[PDB]
């Protein structure tokens, strides 16, 4: 049902989304 | 909150320590840092230059670490230097300088692009390959060819060449050629013909055909077909020797012979022992080379390829003395590696000590430990094969009730060719003076190699005689192979 | 003291690893442990300045 | 592509070059059509014909008579003709378990005749076919080894003789053939 490459993909996507949220919040607070 | 290195006074020591912990062990390990092969020299003396040039075509970290350590030590020595105050050794500009977004962007790039792409590439590369060592497309092609294989069509060398011409791994080498081009190239290679321009492709595909032929043999044994396996072994021989399959081929695999003279003059010599039956100068006169310095090379190379001969062969069961129903025995072979120039030695002269099996728990627990201690085989004599190969023996067993392969063929490589050295040269067939009663003949000097084959299938539940057939063929020469029958007397 | 005697009699019966097998064992385990340790150490250290920059 | 004959009702491939599978399938379909033309009943039974088998038996007996007349050429010719007729003019829907034994029995006689006459290659091919088609008997391995020794194939001769002995090791001819093969091979290498 679930493939390991799909697991890696969703995990790295989640980590990337989290760090992206962090950095965009940081730059928004810095500029505004 | 931490306090980064503001005056560059702590990170130099950290980097120096980190580099020391890597350079030390490497420098330490760098400072710290059975079978006679008579063909290693005779091969490069007969190989053509086009093959040599092709084969030729296809620590500083210690020093840089040491100089970096010296530079860091100099930089440290050039420096000037109640609650606690924690601090981090990393510099301040690395987090507070203008390269602050640089670190985060290179990190997120390495995390989001380099890792997933590389791991997916590695996975797709390791999935498309077969555990045997071939591509999946080639395996599927071979399986489909064996499936819709008419049992009426006889197996030949041309058919297996045509099958190999569909190797998918050849298309990756040259996406511009066609399978017919591959077939023509392999034909020119076997018949010792020049391609003119695609010689680099011909050598490449011939060197790659090894794993392809082994995979085809494995698939044939999986489908339990004996004719295809025998054809595959013969075609491997023909490829490695660069000679078409002929009745008198053991004499054509020799380096310096002319067919137009040998075939037309003589038509009775078909093996090597029959050739050695002739005199010394008679052999050269028959082969039509008339060159003493060149006749010595061919005589030496023809008197140094291994011919097999069994001494004792039977089914053995570990820890017992007889075969019982539904038991798991294995095959034990006592072969005698000989050359066609040596006469035959009777079985009675064997001292019976090399044939008896040791009776100890450590010895009957793993019967292959003593086999895995034999020296490897020397490099093969294939001046037309692109790369360098060692000898190899593919042993396969089938049944005698129908004639079907019943297990995968075991590829044995550890074997002693001591009986082939030039030390025991008095044992010549042309002397016919009963060399058994010789002052130099010591029956304890002749080593008898051993071959043990796991059966992979238990004994039948019935009681009686069940005949088998084990075949031990060569892979590099056209020597006298083994084809014997043996029956397990199930007696309980 | 009888328990110690029985334990010694048992140890005498065990198969102590010889130098050759012990060498392969220690090589494998040390390589594995050092690898996982350096991985953990690098992951722990790299994320500190990244966390300072981002957070 | 393919063309269809009208008066003969034969299907032929009008292509210049055709594959082997297409060719043999076209031939099989033509054979089926020719058999359906001769056979009248729509729901035909796998029961074999009678007049055809009678003609086959008659030609076989006429060939066998030449053996008592010591005529080994016309006998072989008649036997080959009978085998060809049995293979050609017999519909494929006939009983396999009945079409096979008659073929085996006629082929054994043809084998013995060609082996006595001197034609060895055809004999070897016929033994190979009869052995691969599902008949294993020690009376065949002996003749196969004899033929291989006559046409000088010593390795396959020894292998076949060993396989034959591995089934009926109480034979007295297989052992003599094995001894002769071993001697010939030892001279062949020595």
């Amino acid at each position: 049902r679930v493939d390991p490459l799909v697991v890696l993909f969703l995990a790295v996507g989640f980590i990337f989304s989290v760090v992206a949220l962090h950095v965009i919040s940081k730059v928004a607070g810095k500029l505004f | 909150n931490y306090e980064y290195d503001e005056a560059s006074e702590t990170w130099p020591s950290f980097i120096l320590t980190g580099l020391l912990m890597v350079v030390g062990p490497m420098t330490l390990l760098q400072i710290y840092q059975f079978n006679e092969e008579v063909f290693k020299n005779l091969n490069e003396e007969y190989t053509s230059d086009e093959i040599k040039q092709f084969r030729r075509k296809f620590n500083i970290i210690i020093i840089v670490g040491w100089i970096l350590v010296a530079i860091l030590l100099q930089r440290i020595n050039s420096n000037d230097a109640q609650s606690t105050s924690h601090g981090i050794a990393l510099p301040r500009f690395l987090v507070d300088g203008s390269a602050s977004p640089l670190l985060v962007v290179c990190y997120v790039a390495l995390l989001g692009l380099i890792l997933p792409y590389f791991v997916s590439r590695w996975w797709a590369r390791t999935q498309s390959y077969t555990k045997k060592g071939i591509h999946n497309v080639t395996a599927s092609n071979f399986v489909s060819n064996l499936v819709n294989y008419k049992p009426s069509e006889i197996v030949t060398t041309d058919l297996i060449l045509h099958w190999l011409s569909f190797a998918h791994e050849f298309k990756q080498f040259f996406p511009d050629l066609q399978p017919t081009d591959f077939e023509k190239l392999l034909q020119d290679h076997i018949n010792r013909r020049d391609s003119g321009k695609l010689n680099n492709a011909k050598f490449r595909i011939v060197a790659k055909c090894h794993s392809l032929l082994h995979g085809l043999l494995d698939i044939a044994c999986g489908f339990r077909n004996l004719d295809i396996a025998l054809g595959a072994i013969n075609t491997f021989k023909c490829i490695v020797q660069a000679v078409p399959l002929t009745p008198n081929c053991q004499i054509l695999q020799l380096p310096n012979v002319d067919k137009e003279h040998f075939i037309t003059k003589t038509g009775d010599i078909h093996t090597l022992g029959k050739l050695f039956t002739l005199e010394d100068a008679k052999i050269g006169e028959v082969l039509g080379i008339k060159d003493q310095a060149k006749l010595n090379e061919t005589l030496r190379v023809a008197s140094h390829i291994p011919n097999l001969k069994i001494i004792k062969a039977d089914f053995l069961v570990p820890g017992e003395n007889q075969v019982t129903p539904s038991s798991t025995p294995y095959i034990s072979l006592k072969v005698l590696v000989r050359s066609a120039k040596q006469p035959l030695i009777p079985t009675s002269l064997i001292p019976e000590e090399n044939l008896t099996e040791p009776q100890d728990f450590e010895s009957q627990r793993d019967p292959f430990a003593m086999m895995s201690k034999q020296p490897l085989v020397p490099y093969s004599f294939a001046p037309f094969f692109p790369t360098k190969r060692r000898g190899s023996w593919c042993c396969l067993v089938s049944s005698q009730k129908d004639g079907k392969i019943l297990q995968t063929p075991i590829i044995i490589e550890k074997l002693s060719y001591k009986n082939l050295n030039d030390d025991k040269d008095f044992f010549d067939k042309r002397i016919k003076m009963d060399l058994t009663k010789h002052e130099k003949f010591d029956i304890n000097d002749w080593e008898i190699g051993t071959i043990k084959i796991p059966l992979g299938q238990p004994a039948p539940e019935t009681v009686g005689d069940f005949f088998f057939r084990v075949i031990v063929k060569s892979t590099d020469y056209f020597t006298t192979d083994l084809d014997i029958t043996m029956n397990m007397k199930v007696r309980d | 003291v009888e328990f110690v005697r029985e334990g010694t009699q048992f140890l005498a019966k065990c198969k102590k690893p010889d130098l050759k097998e012990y060498t392969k064992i220690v090589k494998a385990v040390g390589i594995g442990f050092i690898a996982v340790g350096i991985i953990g150490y690098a992951i722990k250290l790299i994320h500190i300045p990244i966390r300072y920059v981002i957070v | 592509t393919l063309e269809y004959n009208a008066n003969s009702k034969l299907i032929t491939a009008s292509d210049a070059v055709v594959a082997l599978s297409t060719e043999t399938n076209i031939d099989q379909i033509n054979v089926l059509t020719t058999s359906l033309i001769g056979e009248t009943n729509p729901n035909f039974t796998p029961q074999p014909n009678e007049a055809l088998s009678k003609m086959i038996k008659g030609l076989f007996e006429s060939g066998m008579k030449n053996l008592q007349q010591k005529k080994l050429n016309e006998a072989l010719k008649n036997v080959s003709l009978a085998i060809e007729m049995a293979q050609r003019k017999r519909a494929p829907w006939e009983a396999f378990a009945i079409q096979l034994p008659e073929l085996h029995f006629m082929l054994r006689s043809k084998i013995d005749l060609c082996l006595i006459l001197g034609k060895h290659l055809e004999a070897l091919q016929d033994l190979d076919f009869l052995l691969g088609t599902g008949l294993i008997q020690p009376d065949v391995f002996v003749r196969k080894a004899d033929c291989l020794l006559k046409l000088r194939q010593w390795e396959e001769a020894r292998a076949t003789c060993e396989r034959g002995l591995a089934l009926a090791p109480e034979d007295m001819k297989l052992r003599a053939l094995l001894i002769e093969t071993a001697r010939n091979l030892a001279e062949y290498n020595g």
């Binding site: 049902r1 493939d3 390991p4 697991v7 995990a11 989640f14 980590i15 989290v18 760090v19 962090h22 919040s25 | 702590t10 020591s13 950290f14 320590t17 980190g18 440290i76 420096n79 230097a81 109640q82 606690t84 924690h86 981090i88 050794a89 990393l90 390791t126 555990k131 069961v317 820890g319 539904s326 038991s327 798991t328 728990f361 009957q364 627990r365 | 328990f3 029985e6 334990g7 048992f10 019966k13 065990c14 198969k15 690893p17 012990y22 064992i25 385990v29 594995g32 442990f33 996982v36 340790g37 350096i38 991985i39 953990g40 150490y41 992951i43 722990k44 250290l45 994320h47 966390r51 957070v55 | -």
Partner: protein, 439 residues
Amino acid sequence: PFESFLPEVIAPERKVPYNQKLIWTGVSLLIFLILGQIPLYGIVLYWLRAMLASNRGTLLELGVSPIITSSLIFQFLQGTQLLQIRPESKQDRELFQIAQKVCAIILILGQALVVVMTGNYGAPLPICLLLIFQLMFASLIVMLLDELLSKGYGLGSGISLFIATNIAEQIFWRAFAPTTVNSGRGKEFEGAVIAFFHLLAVRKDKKRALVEAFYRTNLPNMFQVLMTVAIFLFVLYLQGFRYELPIRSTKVRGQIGIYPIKLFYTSNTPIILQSALTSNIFLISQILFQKYPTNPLIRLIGVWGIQMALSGLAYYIQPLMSLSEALLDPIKTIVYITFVLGSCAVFSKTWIEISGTSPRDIAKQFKDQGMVINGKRETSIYRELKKIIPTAAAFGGATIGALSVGSDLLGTLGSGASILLATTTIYGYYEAAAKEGGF
């Protein structure tokens, strides 16, 4: 039992080679470790976090707690014989496996909800929703990753693997810490080798700097590193001990082999049970002395001081950190050593009785498989195993306790139990790889 269609990774129908397995272990470990170093977004029990290998304030706050709790409670429900599992079917096993997941997920939800509603993150809807989503996602990721590593793509379990990884990471950080601490005298590295070479380079006084960085009564030094690597090598040497008795088959004649009986038969269980019991009883005594200030029984059980109890049973059960305390109260030392050894030994006995590895169970398994002793009879296998298995288990537990107390007194960079777990897991991996055969 019930039917549920939940996301699950499929096990390969063919045996995975060793190289792909190792690569999968490496990449899964890297992913899990990166997941543990990322803090949450909406934000503004040291014993468990050190034992369960998790940290607060990051995405790995829950960590492997739901998985370990579900596995423990399910093993307990199996041992108490309330599931009536039948090995004759290949469906009850899958039902048990999916029940593991369905309890793990709801435990994830419960733990995350109680953490977000009671934690120190604050009462003030989108913020708490996002925080709960982050935690549930991380937990389901790590649990499915453990499932993947256990299905066959990995060398073995993921829980013990992650525990060993955190242990090795702590060990390496205790020696190579780049963090500095400046309190009056100056900046000193918190690690061992770093500070050692730093003092060797900057002091320009070798005879003094050597002894100054070699003792380091306040911070870890090179002596602790030498002691811990020495005890590591000793543990490695002590893992090869085994009793190999010769066995032969009777139903299938011709199968000759050996049955290895290792020294660490219980394989690190009795020590972890003893440590858990000691930690729980110490916390209980501490909370009890905190509630009741002074009472006859409360003063008798233990009098806490500087936290370290004194003149109490809790004081007696205190572990030793250095030789100074050893020479301080020899009575406490000689009672604590005997206590820990006896407790670990009896724990080993009870565990070999409970876990179904008793000599009677082994004799029954031999009867099923038909294997017998080489030079002995059939009705003597049980009597011979009674002569080997209990003594071997007791002695292995005793040596494990001795190694633990030795690591505790020598003052290594890490607890003896942590090193034991790490080496045991890695040795199991190596033994599996060697028995299978691979690079």
